Write a protein that binds this DNA or RNA. Structure first.
Lengths: 109, 95, 83, 97, 75, 83, 97, 95, 109
DNA sequence: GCACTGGCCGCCATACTGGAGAATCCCGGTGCCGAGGCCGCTCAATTGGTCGTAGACAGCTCTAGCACCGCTTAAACGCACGTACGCGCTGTCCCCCGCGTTTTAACCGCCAAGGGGATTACTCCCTAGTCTCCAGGCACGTGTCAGATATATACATCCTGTCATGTAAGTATTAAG
DNA sequence: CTTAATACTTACATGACAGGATGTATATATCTGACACGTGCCTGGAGACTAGGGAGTAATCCCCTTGGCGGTTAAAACGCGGGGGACAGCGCGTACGTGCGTTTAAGCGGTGCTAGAGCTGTCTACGACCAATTGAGCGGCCTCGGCACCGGGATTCTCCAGTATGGCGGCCAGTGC
């Protein structure tokens, strides 16, 4: 006589799995006990971060007239947001290249 | 066959379809999304473990990961991520 | 079986292309050998780490995840092959 | 006369060309040879995944390319446009290597 | 228009006549103070200095070419 | 109780003494205000981190141990304060 | 006529004196005041352990001294013995800050 | 009435008197040593835990810690620390 | 009825606490299980490292003809050893100062 | 009448400007292989109940930060002169990019083979937990000399005066036209 | 008789060396509190035993890595040219460095408060554990169309041949001597 199997991601209205993230925190050896709101809050944070980085990648792809985003689009998106660039200052993107940015003295007169 | 290799395909793809229904991804870009989510998850989880350690707390609650995301993410990223986290946890308390 | 010099296999035009990605307009002639030195130092540091994981896993095959972890220790994390 | 562009503007054209681009900049199989020969100095008969040599490649030009914008800043800082080895030790020491 | 620069350089070197010769920056300042567009005449003043040292009307104290200090001849 | 512009409280001869410890032979007079800005920016970083720990602990008093955590989390680890 | 050293000789003397010496190098009380002033902006009515403000004192001086030897490397690299704020901007941006 | 706080005062003092019977310490230097021992213990233990994560292993034995020692410690100190640790586990096994 | 208590550090012939390091690893949240040789090995490594840095500090204090070490001695010891420098490049010592170190162009003549 | 000289005109070096080449942008065409959607599977999230326990709340204590006050100079500051340095120009040298031709090995692609990763199975080595018990470091008290501080000598060094010397400059002489 | 060559002689810049000033070592007295050592303790470390489980180890298999052969070509290499960059010297202008007085505000010593740090008791919320389930997510497959590869014309970007301008030179005629 069990109720319908509903999901915590639908409970929070979120896309990232509350269950899998909760399981990873349990077996990631960070504490023996983990409060219930923590995977919900964490999944929301991850979804928010993916929200901007994915929309910026799509916008840069639309600037490049591509409907399929490429790692170049990801690098262009991530280096054009200063707070995200501070977030990933030490991070290498595979096949990402660098921004088009040259020093002023490098250009001719 | 093969044992299942867990991944972040479906969730990042659905997030893309919400923010941009029309566009697509490369699988290589999709691997960078897997690496991004794994890295940020590791950073936040490690900071949460440190805060549970430092205040002698046996638990990981939303308060200390809120503390961590205020530490790591700069500015309005931190304030907004706080906002979606709070509205999400209030929705979860409403089940 | 044995190899004695492959660091000259990183050719001078390849170094020039790398500097052109770096925004370098002009490259001195003395650049190439010390770039070889710094790259062999970097490769030295990362493979010592990655190999240390590699026979830490009781495995004789170097895997990509080992290079990922070696860079992740060394503060130069790489995206794309996580997993 | 055969046509010839002045020095540097060609060089800036390769700067733009590889800077908007995404591909590998060094040869693959000599890199694999170098990686194996430097690896065998620690453990003999090491075997490499092709993806592993790939990863170690883009990590390598990542660290190198970051070193070159750092030395670029060093070069313009010394009111020069050609990088020099002393720029390299400068960048390495400021990074604390 | 006006007269050419060379005789004004002779007045520049005869203005002070200190122990060493008059220098390049000093003569540029002298032409600026007397009134001259030294900004667009750098090649002009370089060729003028080379011309005057070649004819021996003035002699150079320390520098080489247009640099350093220039002083008047013996007589 | 109100504090207004205590950034100039890091006096100019104090900056000169730091530069002497820093090995600076000669200092421009233009140096001081950007050094104040740089140390300031560093202070909002470390104090924001420390207070995030602090009313994480629900304390109104800032402790040195939280400062040790803030410096360690910044990768600028300090010894001698209970850590 | 009274004694007077040439410039730099005295400066090298403070270099030897202070770089030999180990004490806290800035004034205590205005540094305490500045820490209070900055902390007031983020949270109201904060109290500070005296040891905490001391820990800020060694942390701040260590960070500043590290930036100043980095600045010295930049300045001698630019063939100067006098530093400029652009040196500090260079050192910060090479450090990734 | 006081509550005890654990430190390494007698341990560092004993090791010092082993290597220098005639040399003392300040209290400040002892605080430096306590911070140092906690920091290095933290680094080794964290890397050991991360290695156990990598091999999907739930056990930390001396192999993983020795792996971390070669991993973090630069140069000849690695071979040294392996030497004393190997001798120590040799007596510990023989006891 | 019961054997006399023998400490594990004395079994290893070490000063550093096997029991305390083991207990810290239980409450440092690093693994579910810890092997027996792991804390002994860690204690040996820590004891060797502390012994080496204390030896350098005592030698430096003897060079300063001081009976007791001060954190200036620790700074002097930790900066002039390259392997220790690479161990602790990012670590700052309170009241430590830096090495006596002048650049070549800064000197007269 | 003649020579000086200012003015005016002709010629050459140097800075604008249009035009040709070409590298790349921009437009189609084509075939393709990775994205993406569907299908079968399986394992992990779920749900619900229990159960043990972790921290939140209250309350009490006491202590260390805060506030206030009075001497007490060290240092902050300001100014002034001096000298030492940043930088800008120029000239000079030489070193590295651009481009052309020659070569080679990288890439692909094509095939053979086996090393080992990886997975499953089994049985076992070890470790965590718990109960009990005790000695080792911690809190705390005390005393006491290593070093801080103070006072008197002695060299280091560093700036300057002072004398010797190189060198530039003024000068008589003289020999030749 | 004149006038430039030439030696000769002298004042000034430069440099070598002595010497004092002063700051910094260096040698001796003293007191002191921070280091070091003695003491109660209780609780964290240890010992035995056991339940259980991660993990070591053997079998295998297949797959992904390694080895090797042919073509081809674009990239690597070599060389010529040359133009562009580096950089050294010098010189100026200024901008801190150092050295004097002066103001002051930190520093230090002393008093008193309290607000909160921290310890203690409670308990009640709350999160882990676990059996059964199911559906959401993942392995696998197969198509197609966005996009890689390819071809053709424009456009913009580059560099040079040719023009306008400024300065140099030369000539002539007016005028004063």
């Amino acid at each position: 006589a069990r109720a319908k199997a509903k999901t915590r991601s639908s409970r929070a209205g979120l896309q990232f799995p509350v269950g899998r993230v909760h399981r990873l925190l349990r077996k990631g050896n960070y504490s023996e006990r983990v409060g219930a709101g923590a995977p919900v809050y964490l999944a929301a944070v991850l979804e928010y971060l993916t929200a901007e980085i994915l929309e910026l990648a799509g916008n840069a792809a639309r600037d490049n007239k591509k409907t399929r985003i490429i790692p170049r689009h990801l690098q262009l998106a991530i280096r054009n947001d200063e707070e995200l660039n501070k977030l990933l200052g030490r991070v290498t993107i595979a096949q990402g290249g660098v921004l088009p940015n040259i020093q002023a003295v490098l250009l001719p007169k | 066959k093969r044992s299942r290799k867990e991944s972040y395909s479906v969730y990042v793809y659905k997030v893309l379809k919400q923010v941009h229904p029309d566009t697509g991804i490369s699988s290589k870009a999709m691997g960078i999304m897997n690496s991004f989510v794994n890295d940020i998850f590791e950073r936040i989880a490690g900071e949460a473990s440190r805060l549970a350690h430092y205040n002698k707390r046996s638990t990981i609650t939303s308060r200390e990961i809120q503390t961590a995301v205020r530490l790591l993410l700069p500015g309005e990223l931190a304030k907004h991520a706080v906002s979606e986290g709070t509205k999400a946890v209030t929705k979860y308390t409403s089940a | 079986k044995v190899l004695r010099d492959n660091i000259q296999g990183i050719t001078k035009p390849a170094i020039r292309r790398l500097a052109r990605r770096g925004g370098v307009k002009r490259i001195s002639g003395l650049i190439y050998e010390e770039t070889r030195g710094v790259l062999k130092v970097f490769l030295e540091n990362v493979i010592r780490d990655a190999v240390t994981y590699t026979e830490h896993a009781k495995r004789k095959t170097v895997t990509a995840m080992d290079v990922v972890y070696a860079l992740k220790r060394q503060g130069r994390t790489l995206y794309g092959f996580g997993g | 006369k055969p046509h010839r562009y002045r020095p540097g503007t060609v060089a800036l054209r390769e700067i733009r060309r590889y800077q908007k681009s995404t591909e590998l900049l060094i040869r693959k199989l000599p890199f694999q040879r170098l990686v194996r020969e430097i690896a065998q100095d620690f453990k003999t008969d090491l075997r490499f995944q092709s993806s592993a040599v790939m990863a170690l490649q883009e990590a390598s030009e990542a660290y190198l390319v970051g070193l070159f914008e750092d030395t670029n800043l060093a070069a313009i800082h010394a009111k020069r446009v050609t990088i020099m080895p002393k720029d390299i030790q400068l960048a390495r020491r400021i990074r604390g290597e | 228009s006006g007269p050419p620069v060379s005789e004004l350089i002779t007045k520049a070197v005869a203005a002070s006549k200190e122990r060493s010769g008059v220098s390049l920056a000093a003569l540029k300042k002298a032409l600026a103070a007397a009134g001259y567009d030294v900004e667009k005449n750098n090649s002009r003043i370089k060729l003028g200095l080379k011309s005057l040292v070649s004819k021996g009307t003035l002699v150079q104290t320390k520098g080489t070419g247009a640099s350093g200090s220039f002083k008047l001849n013996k007589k």
